[PDB]
Amino acid sequence: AKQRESTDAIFVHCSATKPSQNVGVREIRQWHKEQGWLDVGYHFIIKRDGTVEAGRDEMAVGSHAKGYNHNSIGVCLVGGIDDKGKFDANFTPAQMQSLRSLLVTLLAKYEGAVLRAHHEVAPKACPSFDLKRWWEKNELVTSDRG
Numbered sequence: 304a305k306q307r308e309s310t311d312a313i314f315v316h317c318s319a320t321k322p323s324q325n326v327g328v329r330e331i332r333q334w335h336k337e338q339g340w341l342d343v344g345y346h347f348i349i350k351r352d353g354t355v356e357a358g359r360d361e362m363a364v365g366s367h368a369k370g371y372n373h374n375s376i377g378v379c380l381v382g383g384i385d386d387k388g389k390f391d392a393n394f395t396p397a398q399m400q401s402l403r404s405l406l407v408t409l410l411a412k413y414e415g416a417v418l419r420a421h422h423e424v425a426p427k428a429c430p431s432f433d434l435k436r437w438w439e440k441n442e443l444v445t446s447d448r449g
Protein backbone atom coordinates (compact mmCIF):
# COMPACT_ATOMS: atom_id res chain seq x y z
CA ALA A 304 0.00 0.00 0.00
CA LYS A 305 1.57 3.51 -0.67
CA GLN A 306 1.46 7.35 -0.88
CA ARG A 307 0.69 9.37 -4.05
CA GLU A 308 3.48 10.71 -6.25
CA SER A 309 1.69 13.97 -7.02
CA THR A 310 -1.60 15.82 -6.29
CA ASP A 311 -2.92 17.24 -9.47
CA ALA A 312 -6.49 17.63 -8.21
CA ILE A 313 -8.96 17.83 -5.33
CA PHE A 314 -12.20 16.09 -6.37
CA VAL A 315 -15.52 16.82 -4.68
CA HIS A 316 -18.19 14.08 -4.32
CA CYS A 317 -21.45 13.52 -2.38
CA SER A 318 -22.31 10.20 -0.59
CA ALA A 319 -25.68 9.93 -2.44
CA THR A 320 -27.72 9.83 0.76
CA LYS A 321 -30.95 11.50 1.81
CA PRO A 322 -31.46 14.44 4.30
CA SER A 323 -32.40 12.18 7.22
CA GLN A 324 -29.20 10.26 6.85
CA ASN A 325 -27.04 11.90 9.39
CA VAL A 326 -23.97 9.75 8.72
CA GLY A 327 -20.13 10.13 8.74
CA VAL A 328 -16.93 8.04 8.22
CA ARG A 329 -17.90 5.26 10.70
CA GLU A 330 -20.83 4.29 8.43
CA ILE A 331 -19.37 5.05 4.93
CA ARG A 332 -16.13 3.13 5.85
CA GLN A 333 -18.35 0.17 6.78
CA TRP A 334 -20.32 0.45 3.52
CA HIS A 335 -17.16 0.57 1.40
CA LYS A 336 -15.60 -2.43 3.08
CA GLU A 337 -18.83 -4.48 2.67
CA GLN A 338 -18.37 -3.67 -1.08
CA GLY A 339 -14.84 -5.20 -1.06
CA TRP A 340 -12.49 -2.22 -0.67
CA LEU A 341 -9.86 -1.92 1.97
CA ASP A 342 -11.06 1.33 3.61
CA VAL A 343 -13.11 4.46 3.01
CA GLY A 344 -12.03 5.78 -0.44
CA TYR A 345 -12.21 9.49 0.53
CA HIS A 346 -9.59 11.54 2.28
CA PHE A 347 -12.25 13.84 3.95
CA ILE A 348 -16.00 13.53 4.85
CA ILE A 349 -18.05 16.62 5.73
CA LYS A 350 -21.04 15.58 7.94
CA ARG A 351 -24.31 17.58 7.72
CA ASP A 352 -23.62 19.70 10.79
CA GLY A 353 -20.33 20.88 9.09
CA THR A 354 -17.91 18.54 11.02
CA VAL A 355 -15.08 17.44 8.71
CA GLU A 356 -13.75 13.95 9.54
CA ALA A 357 -10.67 12.41 8.05
CA GLY A 358 -10.89 9.19 6.04
CA ARG A 359 -7.80 7.83 4.34
CA ASP A 360 -4.51 9.47 5.18
CA GLU A 361 -4.21 12.77 3.39
CA MET A 362 -1.16 11.51 1.46
CA ALA A 363 -2.43 8.03 0.39
CA VAL A 364 -4.04 6.72 -2.79
CA GLY A 365 -7.77 6.45 -2.13
CA SER A 366 -10.63 5.00 -4.22
CA HIS A 367 -13.02 7.75 -5.30
CA ALA A 368 -12.47 8.65 -8.94
CA LYS A 369 -11.11 5.77 -11.05
CA GLY A 370 -8.21 6.59 -13.23
CA TYR A 371 -7.50 9.48 -10.87
CA ASN A 372 -6.91 7.79 -7.59
CA HIS A 373 -3.21 7.92 -8.25
CA ASN A 374 -2.86 11.72 -8.12
CA SER A 375 -5.72 13.41 -6.17
CA ILE A 376 -7.60 14.20 -2.92
CA GLY A 377 -11.22 13.06 -2.69
CA VAL A 378 -13.63 15.06 -0.55
CA CYS A 379 -17.15 13.84 0.24
CA LEU A 380 -20.32 15.73 1.22
CA VAL A 381 -23.02 13.74 3.09
CA GLY A 382 -26.17 14.12 1.01
CA GLY A 383 -26.89 14.22 -2.71
CA ILE A 384 -30.30 12.59 -3.25
CA ASP A 385 -33.87 13.15 -2.30
CA ASP A 386 -36.46 10.60 -1.14
CA LYS A 387 -37.27 9.64 -4.72
CA GLY A 388 -33.63 8.63 -5.29
CA LYS A 389 -32.98 11.53 -7.69
CA PHE A 390 -29.85 13.72 -7.43
CA ASP A 391 -30.51 16.88 -5.42
CA ALA A 392 -28.14 19.56 -4.00
CA ASN A 393 -29.51 19.28 -0.49
CA PHE A 394 -26.38 20.24 1.40
CA THR A 395 -26.66 22.33 4.54
CA PRO A 396 -25.21 25.99 4.92
CA ALA A 397 -22.81 24.60 7.49
CA GLN A 398 -21.47 21.87 5.17
CA MET A 399 -20.80 24.40 2.41
CA GLN A 400 -19.01 26.75 4.84
CA SER A 401 -16.71 23.99 6.06
CA LEU A 402 -16.11 22.85 2.49
CA ARG A 403 -14.96 26.31 1.34
CA SER A 404 -12.23 26.65 4.12
CA LEU A 405 -11.01 23.00 3.68
CA LEU A 406 -10.60 23.65 -0.06
CA VAL A 407 -8.82 27.07 0.35
CA THR A 408 -6.49 25.19 2.77
CA LEU A 409 -5.99 22.29 0.36
CA LEU A 410 -5.43 24.37 -2.77
CA ALA A 411 -2.82 26.27 -0.88
CA LYS A 412 -0.88 23.34 0.37
CA TYR A 413 -0.83 21.30 -2.86
CA GLU A 414 0.94 23.64 -5.05
CA GLY A 415 -0.54 23.60 -8.54
CA ALA A 416 -3.56 21.30 -7.73
CA VAL A 417 -6.80 22.04 -9.57
CA LEU A 418 -10.29 21.88 -8.01
CA ARG A 419 -12.70 19.39 -9.73
CA ALA A 420 -16.19 17.98 -9.53
CA HIS A 421 -16.40 14.19 -10.22
CA HIS A 422 -19.10 14.77 -12.93
CA GLU A 423 -16.56 16.64 -15.11
CA VAL A 424 -14.52 13.50 -15.70
CA ALA A 425 -17.05 10.58 -15.37
CA PRO A 426 -20.66 10.05 -16.64
CA LYS A 427 -22.16 10.75 -13.16
CA ALA A 428 -24.29 13.46 -11.50
CA CYS A 429 -21.97 13.38 -8.43
CA PRO A 430 -21.59 15.81 -6.53
CA SER A 431 -25.18 16.89 -7.57
CA PHE A 432 -24.38 20.60 -7.86
CA ASP A 433 -22.57 22.92 -10.13
CA LEU A 434 -19.12 23.35 -8.48
CA LYS A 435 -18.00 26.39 -10.52
CA ARG A 436 -21.16 28.44 -9.74
CA TRP A 437 -21.01 27.71 -6.00
CA TRP A 438 -17.19 28.33 -5.78
CA GLU A 439 -17.62 31.63 -7.63
CA LYS A 440 -21.00 33.11 -6.72
CA ASN A 441 -21.81 31.15 -3.55
CA GLU A 442 -25.03 29.95 -5.24
CA LEU A 443 -25.96 26.26 -4.76
CA VAL A 444 -28.01 24.79 -7.62
CA THR A 445 -28.84 21.18 -8.37
CA SER A 446 -26.80 19.98 -11.35
CA ASP A 447 -25.27 17.12 -13.21
CA ARG A 448 -22.73 19.44 -14.85
CA GLY A 449 -20.55 22.30 -13.60
Ligand SMILES: [Zn+2]
Nearest residue numbers: 316317421429
Ligand atom coordinates in the same frame (compact mmCIF):
# COMPACT_ATOMS: atom_id res chain seq x y z
ZN1 LIG B 1 -18.29 10.88 -6.94
